[PDB]
Design a protein around this ligand. Structure first.
Ligand code: HEM
Length: 153
């Protein structure tokens, strides 16, 4: 579990994101899509985007970026007490969008990357440790619900 000190680091770093949610959200999704092009294909909504230039110009991608990060931010602020918030996300991502848990690992990596890129020398080793733990907890609890539903993998 996370200690209170680690949760404080996580939420202090999250304050950087909240200064510019749409910007961080677009940066994270583009990193995901370019690093792991198979993820783009899970989005009928964005499949048409071929180049990074097109992704950067898409206002709808920014809009989904706010939706995604708004949901993740509310979950982090629960400090692990997130059962009610996680349940619908697990259910829709497992049974409707058909997202393997591996992709949740990829986007976790993309978040860490983007934070380093946007905040050089301002994302501490302690904070990276804490964020990593918090995203692992998120994956673990979603994975538990995937396994229930027969989607483990
Ligand atoms: C930090 C992890 C993530 C969060 C917080 C998140 C959150 C959300 C939210 C709030 C929605 C809208 C409501 C819903 O459909 O449940 C959504 C939709 C969706 N998500 Fe995610 N998501 C995450 C990861 C991913 C990943 C890794 C993929 C695929 C590679 C993915 C694929 C999709 C798709 C395809 C939709 C539907 C978009 C549309 O057609 O409007 N999500 N997500």
């Amino acid at each position: 579990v996370l200690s209170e000190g680690e949760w404080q680091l996580v939420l202090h770093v999250w304050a950087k994101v909240e200064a510019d949610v749409a910007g961080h959200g677009q940066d994270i999704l583009i990193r995901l899509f370019k690093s792991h092009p198979e993820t783009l294909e899970k989005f009928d909504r964005f499949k048409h985007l071929k180049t990074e230039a097109e992704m950067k110009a898409s206002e709808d991608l920014k809009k989904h970026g706010v939706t995604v990060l708004t949901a993740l931010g509310a979950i982090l602020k629960k400090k692990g007490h997130h059962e009610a918030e996680l349940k619908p996300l697990a259910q829709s991502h497992a049974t409707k969008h058909k997202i393997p848990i591996k992709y949740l690992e990829f986007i976790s990596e993309a978040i860490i990357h983007v934070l380093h890129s946007r905040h050089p020398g301002d994302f501490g080793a302690d904070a990276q440790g804490a964020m990593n733990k918090a995203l692992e907890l998120f994956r673990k609890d979603i994975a538990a619900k995937y396994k229930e539903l027969g989607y483990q993998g």
